[PDB]
Protein: Bromodomain adjacent to zinc finger domain protein 2B
Organism: Homo sapiens
Amino acid sequence: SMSVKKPKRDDSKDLALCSMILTEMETHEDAWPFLLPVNLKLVPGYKKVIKKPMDFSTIREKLSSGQYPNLETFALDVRLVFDNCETFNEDDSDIGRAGHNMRKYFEKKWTDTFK
């Protein structure tokens, strides 16, 4: 409360460490469905169904330009990419499986880096 604060967690490396995580997601072999925004002219259904499209290139631009106020808003956009993928793709599809694999990969790196 006023003039009463929990000890200051060092967040000065969060920007760099989120960038490294995102590099590793970018270079994973199953990243290909997620590298670029879904083309909303060419994928029937996507625009109406997926209210907040997100992809790795868009996270990368947001990160590089100071649009994440903290490391949690960054994790929310990463998770959004996989939530969207599950919303639109059958579990038993190449893209569906890719999404599950990448989410697992992300959550491990996240825990190991920050928890």
Notes: The chain has one domain: 1-115. Residues 94-114 form the longest helix (21 residues). The chain is about 55% helix and 0% strand.
